[PDB]
Each structure stands twice: as C-alpha cells, then as structure tokens.
C-alpha cells in the first residue's frame, strides 16, 4: 500500500462520544470538538516505516514507527502510551496502545486505504469508535 499523502478530511463521526468515554470533561470536550474536528494528516511511508504528522489548531503531533516494532506516543486524550502497529490486512494497519501509567479505556487506532483513493481513520476507546475519512489534498 501507499499511504503517503497530505490528507484532508471529508468526514468525521463520533468524536465527542470518544472523548466522553475517555473521561474528558464537558468544557474541554467542547473546546476539542470546536477546534480539533478537522485534522490535517501528513503521511510519509517508506516500506513499513512511517512518519505521520497530525495538525489541528490545538495539537500538532508527529509519530515515527515501523510496523511490528513498539514505539511511544500518546493517546488521543494526551496520555503517554506504548504502541504497536500491525497489518490487519494488506491495506489496513491497526495500532494497539497501552498506557505507561495508570488505567483507562482500551484505546486503539486504525488506518485503511479504500479502493476509491480515500483513507479511513478510526480511533477507539472501549467500544466507542470515532471515524474520519480523508482524500489527498
């Protein structure tokens, strides 16, 4: 697969509920929904090595990983975690996260290239799923 691109959002679903499950308080959720519902995602892929930069006005992140090798990042609610990405299938990666400290909902994210040229991202907390869809700019 080639995930590389400057991806722009065309759909976002269920972000507020995700934050609610993660325990983000109502005022902070309002702020996040208003400001972080339209991320821009830059991906650079070389084989199974990835760089992903996600930009919103309230948080810019950059991660670097190799599929199958643990790395450190943060959950969507900003808690440090260990992460491990695997190929669920040829065109879909899945990242399982484990908090460095304390307890919380089980979190994960996925990225999937669709047959139409788009990118589906999901973020999960326990059973709740937030889905974003992107197309290259």
Q: Which residues bind ligand RET (CB under 6 A)?
A: 19, 24, 28, 31-32, 36, 39, 54, 56, 58-59, 76-78, 121, 123, 132
- Residue nearer to Na ion on the CB measure, 12 or 110: 110
Q: Which of 58, 64, 68, 78 binds Na ion (CB under 5 A)?
A: 68
How many CA atoms, within 13 angstroms, populate the side-chain half-sphere of residue 96?
7
From CA 42, how far away is CA 57, in angstroms rounded? 15
Q: From ligand RET, Na ion, none, which one binds at residue 76 (CB under 5 to 8 Å depending on kind)?
A: ligand RET
Task: Return the residue matching tokens 């507020």.
Answer: 16
Q: From ligand RET, Na ion, none, which one binds at residue 26 (CB under 5 to 8 Å depending on kind)?
A: none
3-state secondary structure of 119: strand
CB of 48 to Na ion, least distance (A): 5
Q: From Na ion, ligand RET, none, which one binds at residue 68 (CB under 5 to 8 Å depending on kind)?
A: Na ion
> How many angstroms separate the Cα of 36 from the Cα of each of 15, 31, 39, 58, 113?
9, 8, 6, 7, 22
Task: Return the residue matching tokens 């999901």.
Answer: 122
Per the CB < 8 A criterion, the answer to whether 36 and 30 are in contact is: no
- Residue nearer to Na ion on the CB measure, 90 or 103: 90
- Residue nearer to ligand RET on the CB measure, 26 or 31: 31
User: Which residues contact Na ion by CB under 5 A?
Assistant: 48, 68
């Amino acid at each position: 697969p080639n995930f590389s691109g400057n991806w722009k959002i065309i759909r976002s679903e269920n972000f507020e509920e995700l934050l609610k499950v993660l325990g983000v308080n109502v005022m902070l959720r309002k702020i996040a929904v208003a400001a972080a519902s339209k991320p821009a995602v830059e991906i650079k892929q070389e084989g199974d090595t990835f760089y992903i930069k996600t930009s919103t006005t309230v948080r810019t992140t950059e991660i670097n990983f190799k599929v199958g090798e643990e790395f450190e990042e943060q959950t969507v609610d900003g808690r440090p975690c260990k992460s491990l990405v695997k190929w669920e299938s040829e065109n879909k990666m899945v990242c399982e996260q484990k908090l460095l400290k304390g307890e919380g909902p089980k979190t994960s994210w996925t990225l999937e290239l669709t047959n139409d040229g788009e990118l589906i991202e999901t973020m999960t907390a326990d059973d709740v799923v937030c889905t974003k869809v992107y197309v290259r700019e």
